[PDB]
């Protein structure tokens, strides 16, 4: 979400996808692998955080008949301290988890971009805004091979080289 200016509101099929523009027509699709990886890591994070303890805490005060004022002030003091500790831990926990989540999704997008650049070796160029200036006429079946990770880099090499 850096050099890509903005997201695609029309991409309702997945988190990441391909939007091509060739001589045949327009088309958008979703990359199942990267999206499933991201939602698997975030899902596992949720399953790691949606935890309630099995430790039982008994009633130490008394709402109907107040305990002695000294031990009551000690109990209130300790409970307030623990409350501060868990408030801090919850705040820092949520903040850190959100940071690692956003940076994780950015890392997945950048890795998808890197592997798509790995498929097209010298048969296409990079524009700088997340697109691949493809140097030869790539049919819809050719771009379908790019999405399926089956693009032969050598069978279209010289045609895309002299341009």
């Amino acid at each position: 979400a850096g050099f890509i200016e903005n997201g695609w509101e029309g991409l309702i099929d997945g988190w990441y996808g391909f939007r091509h523009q060739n001589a045949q027509g327009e088309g958008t699709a979703a990359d199942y692998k990267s999206t499933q990886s991201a939602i698997d890591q975030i899902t596992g994070k949720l399953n790691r955080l949606i935890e309630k303890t099995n430790q039982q805490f008994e009633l130490i005060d008394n709402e109907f008949n107040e305990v002695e004022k000294q031990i009551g002030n000690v109990i209130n003091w300790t409970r307030d301290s623990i409350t501060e500790v868990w408030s801090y831990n919850a705040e820092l926990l949520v903040a850190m988890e959100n940071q690692h989540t956003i940076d994780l999704a950015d890392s997945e997008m950048d890795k998808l971009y890197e592997r798509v650049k790995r498929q097209l070796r010298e048969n296409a160029e990079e524009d700088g805004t997340g697109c691949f200036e493809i140097f030869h006429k790539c049919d819809d079946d050719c771009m379908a091979s790019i999405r399926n990770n089956t693009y032969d880099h050598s069978k279209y090499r010289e045609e895309a080289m002299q341009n």
């Binding site: 509101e9 709402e63 868990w86």
Partner: protein
């Protein structure tokens, strides 16, 4: 062929380490706020004490007659409950309450105390049953006919079980010194309670108290835990509320204080005065004094956890 990511029109703002208000695609809540205004007790043996006080179940006022040998996994205290019929007060109240909350119920046992030369059926108007009665588990020890010398007696009870016993006696403080002499006789009285871990220490204190339940006298209840094969002893010479039966703990339970209804349709392990907290979230913002297996209480009202990528609209 271009690459990109998805986005939405209206995202959800979350907080991170670097910025506060980063709009992402999806986010879930981690702090619980929804409360069920009932006591979810599905699948739990529950005893609603109601008008009966928790300590009364050991002494047995009328309102506790149906709680003398209760058994439960969850104990609920009500604010309209009372531990006493005759105006009195327990020593170490909250200690005995905390002991009884996790007891799993109580099992009474006849201690086997016989008396000679002393009448043993002392009653009062505030302990109403068929007429004037007293605590179902206690014996108000008085004198034979009326003003007379109280024979300095001593009675012992050996804990013949494998679990500690709950021994509760009483010290009567009458409305005046002349009433103490009327019930027990003149002279300095004393009540000695002995064992291996106990060493006390009792003598009455007559005087005028404020009329509670229409009575000016008071009764001070005391208790101890008698270890197995250990014997408790009482050397008294007047003003004694003797124990009829001793209590034995059944097992384990949970004690809560609430003012909402009982509901056996929902299940929950986190209770507070306002109801039950049924949630999988790790944090809650309902009640800091919630008991049981609860989410850890935090001061924040909401803490949105990002479950999706950052939302960058066009």
């Amino acid at each position: 062929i271009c690459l990109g990511h998805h986005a939405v029109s209206n995202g959800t703002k979350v907080n991170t380490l670097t910025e506060r208000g980063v709009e992402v695609v999806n986010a879930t809540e981690t702090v619980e706020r929804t409360n069920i205004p009932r006591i979810c007790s599905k699948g739990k043996r529950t005893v609603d004490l109601g008008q009966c006080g928790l300590l009364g179940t050991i002494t047995g006022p009328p309102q506790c007659d149906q709680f003398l040998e209760f058994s439960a996994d969850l104990i609920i205290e009500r604010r309209e409950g009372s531990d006493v019929c005759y105006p009195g007060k327990f020593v170490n109240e909250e200690a005995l309450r905390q002991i009884l909350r996790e007891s799993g119920g109580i099992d009474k046992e006849a201690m086997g105390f016989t008396y000679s030369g002393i009448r043993t059926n002392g009653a009062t108007s505030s302990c109403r049953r068929s007429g004037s009665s007293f605590y179902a588990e206690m014996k108000w020890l008085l004198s034979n006919t009326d003003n007379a010398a109280f024979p300095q007696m001593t009675k012992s009870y050996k804990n013949t079980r494998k679990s500690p016993a709950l021994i509760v006696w009483g010290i009567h403080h009458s409305g005046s010194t002349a009433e103490q002499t009327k019930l027990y006789g003149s002279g300095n009285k004393l009540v000695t309670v002995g064992s291996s871990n106990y060493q006390q220490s009792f003598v009455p204190s007559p005087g005028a108290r404020t009329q509670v339940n229409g009575q000016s006298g008071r009764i001070d209840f005391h208790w101890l835990m008698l270890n197995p094969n250990d014997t408790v002893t009482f050397s008294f010479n007047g003003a004694f509320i003797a124990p009829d039966r001793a209590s034995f703990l059944r097992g384990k339970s949970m004690g809560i204080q609430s003012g909402v209804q009982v509901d056996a349709n929902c299940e929950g392990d986190c209770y507070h005065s306002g109801g039950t907290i049924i949630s999988n979230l790790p944090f809650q913002n309902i009640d800091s004094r919630a008991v049981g297996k609860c989410p850890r209480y935090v001061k924040q009202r909401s803490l949105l956890l990002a479950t999706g990528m950052k939302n960058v609209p066009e």
